[PDB]
Amino acid sequence: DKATIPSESPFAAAEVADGAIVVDIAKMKYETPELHVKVGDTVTWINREAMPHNVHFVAGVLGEAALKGPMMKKEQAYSLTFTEAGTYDYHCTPHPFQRGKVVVE
Ligand SMILES: [Cu+2]
């Protein structure tokens, strides 16, 4: 796999780690739809809305399996630690019109 998952379930926005690279989910979009990070960085998405959201990477992107992240309620967060360079497209499972990518270099 090209990322590790610190927590399989969401956690409170207040618990975001030092040095995490935050992507807000606000106004029904990933507010940073193209994020550039380095190997070893942890990206944390934070849902700021009442509607739940996740991040979903199809098979072959983060690794062999799809990664269907857990649904984040309002003011919850979810992280991925990227361990290899690449370009990692994702969408929101219930809202597939909501798309983003993480470029790891
Ligand atoms: Cu969504």
Declared resolution, Å: 1.0
Distance 17 CA to ligand 1 centre (A): 23
Query: Could you report how far apart the first and last alpha carbons of the chain are, in Å?
Result: 16
What is the sign of the dihedral through the CA atoms of 66, 47, 27 and 3? negative
Solved how? X-ray
Report which of 36, 53, 42, 54 is spatially closest to residue 101, judged by C-alpha positions. Answer: 36
Distance 96 CA to ligand 1 centre (A): 7
Distance 24 CA to ligand 1 centre (A): 12
HEC letters along the chain: CCEECCCCCCEEHHHCCCCCEEEEEECCEECCCEEEECCCCEEEEEECCCCCECCEECCCCCCCCCEECCCECCCEEEEEEECCCEEEEEECCCCCCCEEEEEEC
Q: What fold does the segment set 1-105 form as a domain?
A: Immunoglobulin-like (2.60.40)
Residues with Cβ within 8 Å of residue 62, at least 6 apart in sequence: 1, 2, 3, 80, 88
